[PDB]
């Protein structure tokens, strides 16, 4: 498994900081601090990962969610990242994400941003 | 808040079953059973929701993750749903999702499915 | 082929109107009028479709683009729809879309909306 | 406008080749050759771009479609790229894409890949 490879502090191309602990069972728990958007300080995250990945050089599937409410701000929105962990000297988490805002029904067509983040250990 | 509105059993257009408990703090915990794909029985889910939504008729942002490993099967993949809860007589969770498979680096361009699920209480 | 099935006037769940002509070669040409957003009147569209689909009951893959500039307005943005045509008594075009705005580099993480539209002939 | 900046040969991170001509009106026409997937040689593309972008340093919105049928192969699928052109010494087209396959109704939940391509002139 990749419990030890995933656990730790990761940084994306925006300068955001993802701090995660991987459990033996498949759990991801930690904190996220965004460098951009309607965000300040750390937010709770939770998610899941494949604790028994293929042994054929494939990556390890995982995902997590942040709801953008903490003691400081409430951005009435949530992001989910879906992606894979790729181990080795330049380990990476390669993700795509969906950021949904709470909207009225009239604006719901415009509720959801999509993007991609790559996380490294440096 | 929508802790009471979200907590419970939901069903999507595929006939899948999402069983969730919403915590007062923003946590989502439960199980997912897919009617389709490389899946059997229930899988753990975790996620987050906005526990203090806007009071202007907007929906409530939330998201969750399933890693597709349980005691029966391992599909080496994870889905994340990002969406909003809309309360009332015909409550709904309207989502978009990202399903990432673990892949080799050569196949990583094709790692991620996108789609949309609408969940109802009936 | 589905040249005759695709050609014509389609309407989505938002009340927008998609008017398309399918060419024998795979071309899609027409106009789009959005019921929502920073849009008024008709905009040019172009796209492509599979002119020789599988004969196994599969749908017919297609896509198209609108840039949201016409004589009336310029929303500095473009949407692409990717989807499939499914023929028969209740024909449908089932799509997902990506709406990209021109942004500064600082805001580029938030450039792109994602959603889904279903088009019918009625 | 960016007619002159967009027109030409572009290459993505996969080694695919996008050859486009931008018209004064907003048209994109050209050919695409994928380095990956069920593809060989060149395929027709068409699309649109914002011919009068904001003058505030924002990028220029555009999109295009390929249906994956040519004289050599038919992959019964279409990709749409949605993105923005950013000019200057290291010009780039930054995109996200949706690749839809024709599917049966039973498999339609799994019809659509999502990803991201960055195109450069070198």
UniProtKB/Swiss-Prot annotation, chains A, B, C, D:
This protein's source sits in the domain of life called Bacteria
Where does this protein hold biotin?
32, 43, 81, 97, 109
Q: Which positions does the motif Cell attachment site occupy?
A: 48-50
Q: Which UniProt keywords apply?
A: Biotin, Secreted, Signal
Which is one GO molecular function term here?
A: biotin binding
This protein's GO CC annotations: extracellular region
Where would you find this protein in the cell? Secreted
According to the entry, every stretch annotated as the Avidin-like domain falls at: 3-122
Q: What does this protein do?
A: The biological function of streptavidin is not known. Forms a strong non-covalent specific complex with biotin (one molecule of biotin per subunit of streptavidin).
Q: Which family does it belong to?
A: Belongs to the avidin/streptavidin family.
Q: How does it assemble?
A: Homotetramer.
Q: What is this protein called?
A: Streptavidin
The species this protein was found in = Streptomyces avidinii
Instruction: Report which part of the complete sequence is shown.
Output: 38 to 157 of 183
